[PDB]
A paper describes a structure:
Crystallization of [name] exclusively succeeded for apo-protein, which carries the [4Fe]H-cluster but lacks the [2Fe]H-site. Variants of [name] apo-protein were crystallized in space group P32 2 1, with a single chain in the asymmetric unit. However, comparisons of crystal structures of CpI apo- and holo-protein with apo-[name] demonstrated that a lack of cofactor does not affect the configuration of the putative PT pathway. In the corresponding [name]-variant [name], the glutamine residue precisely adopts the conformation of the glutamic acid residue in [name] wild type. While glutamine occupies the entire space of the native carboxyl group and thus clearly interrupts the putative PT pathway, an exchange to alanine may support additional H2O molecules to bridge the gap.
Numbering used by the authors: 65 to 155, 161 to 350, 363 to 490
């Protein structure tokens, strides 16, 4: 009946049962860091590969890292951002909003439908990975999509509502879901405990690559700072020819839950962006953008970025944006005060700083110090080169992008 019950029923079938399906799971990073708490341990006290082993012991045929999906979201959203910027430089509006939090998307559709054109058309990391698994991977393995089950483990009590949006399906059959069942961190922790699985005592297991070949999770060593930051990095590095360091956002005075940064961008010498800048000098009235120039004509643009945590705080930001008192070009809205590490499906703690501990243990110090870039991932490159085409192209649009419905679904 429940989605947990349905997923477990699929896993309960012997692997040689004629009605057995190919049961896949993907795991969010916020789940990996918090799952140890379900055993009464500290965040990060169990390793990612111990979790992978635990999931394989439940019977999953494939065990994926949602970060693979996030590399797709970075490719698409980075390209989408650069495209909106390019169109506006040469005279899909700006500012652009992120779209990965279903709590934001619900409030958008119900209370701010006039803002729909400003929102990124990207699906979330979990939905992009799911779309890929029941298209590319199904084909590769010679499995009918109807014989694939996709399960995600999320820190979030809203991700099932995201997965359930009707058109997230295979070949216009709304009963053939791209993503079937979402299980929360605590629900998974309970499943393990009910079965006498102690993650902390497991050997290291292995991840599967959603490409269906090669070792590991199909994601390179290192960190990105998350999809919004890496989308900015994608756009910035193409625009300027220079690397964007890890961002450090600053709190906004007088606005709760809002952080910001400004990113100055000079176009690369000889680039189209350099040409556009010189040669061509709604509800959210754009202000034409923030620009600067120098005496010799080396002009640039300043990208103004905001992150809102908490939907109440986001409502106050939107009011100020509509008034023209807050001026931003790219805005992320997340429903949870602490973001996904503090999601509604996470363990409950008496520790007032538990989300800080989760954030700190989210990735190890070795990887924290190393910046990775999604477009350099050979698995991602191969997927675009041999299957998807170009970011924002027809196939990528079909599988990886979405739309919004005024009034909600
Ligand atoms: S911020 Fe909260 S509601 Fe939004 S995706 Fe993350 S866990 Fe879910
Ligand atoms: Cl996601
Ligand atoms: Na593997």
């Amino acid at each position: 009946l429940s989605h947990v019950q349905q997923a477990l029923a699929e896993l309960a079938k012997p692997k040689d049962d004629p009605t057995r399906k190919h049961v896949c799971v993907q795991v969010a990073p916020a789940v990996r860091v918090a799952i140890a708490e379900t055993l009464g341990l500290a965040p990060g006290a169990t390793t990612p590969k111990q979790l992978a082993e635990g999931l394989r012991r439940l019977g999953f045929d494939e065990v994926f890292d949602t970060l693979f999906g996030a590399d797709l979201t970075i490719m698409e959203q980075g390209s989408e951002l650069l495209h909106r910027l390019t169109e506006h430089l040469e005279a899909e509006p700006l500012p652009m909003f992120t779209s990965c939090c279903p709590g934001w998307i619900a409030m958008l559709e119900k209370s701010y439908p006039d803002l729909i054109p400003y929102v990124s058309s990207c699906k979330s990391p979990q939905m992009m990975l799911a779309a890929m698994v029941k298209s590319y991977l199904a084909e590769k393995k010679g499995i009918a999509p109807k014989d694939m089950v996709m399960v995600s483990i999320m820190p979030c009590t809203r991700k099932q509502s995201e997965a359930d949006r009707d058109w997230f399906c295979v070949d216009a059959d709304p009963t053939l879901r791209q993503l079937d069942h979402v299980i929360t961190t605590v629900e998974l922790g309970n499943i393990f405990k009910e079965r006498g699985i102690n993650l902390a005592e497991l050997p290291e297991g292995e991840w599967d690559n959603p490409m269906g070949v090669g070792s590991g999770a199909g994601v390179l060593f290192g960190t990105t700072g998350g999809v919004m930051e890496a989308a900015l990095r994608t756009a910035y590095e193409l625009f300027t020819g220079t690397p964007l360091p890890r961002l450090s956002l600053s709190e906004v005075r007088g606005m709760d839950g809002i952080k910001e940064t400004n990113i100055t961008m000079v176009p690369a010498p000889g680039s189209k962006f350099e040409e556009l800048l010189k040669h061509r000098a709604g509800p959210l009235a754009w202000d034409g953008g923030a620009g600067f120039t120098s005496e010799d004509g080396r002009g640039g643009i300043t990208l103004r970025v905001a992150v809102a945590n908490g939907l109440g705080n986001a409502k106050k930001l939107i009011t100020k944006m509509q008034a023209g008192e807050a001026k931003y070009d790219f805005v992320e809205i997340m429903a949870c005060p602490a973001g996904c590490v503090g999601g509604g499906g996470q363990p409950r703690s008496t520790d007032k700083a538990i989300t800080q501990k989760r954030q700190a243990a989210l990735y190890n110090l070795d990887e924290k110090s190393t910046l990775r870039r999604s477009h350099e991932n050979p698995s991602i490159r191969e997927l675009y080169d041999t299957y998807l085409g170009e970011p924002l192209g027809h196939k990528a649009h079909e599988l990886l992008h979405t739309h919004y419905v005024a009034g909600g679904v």
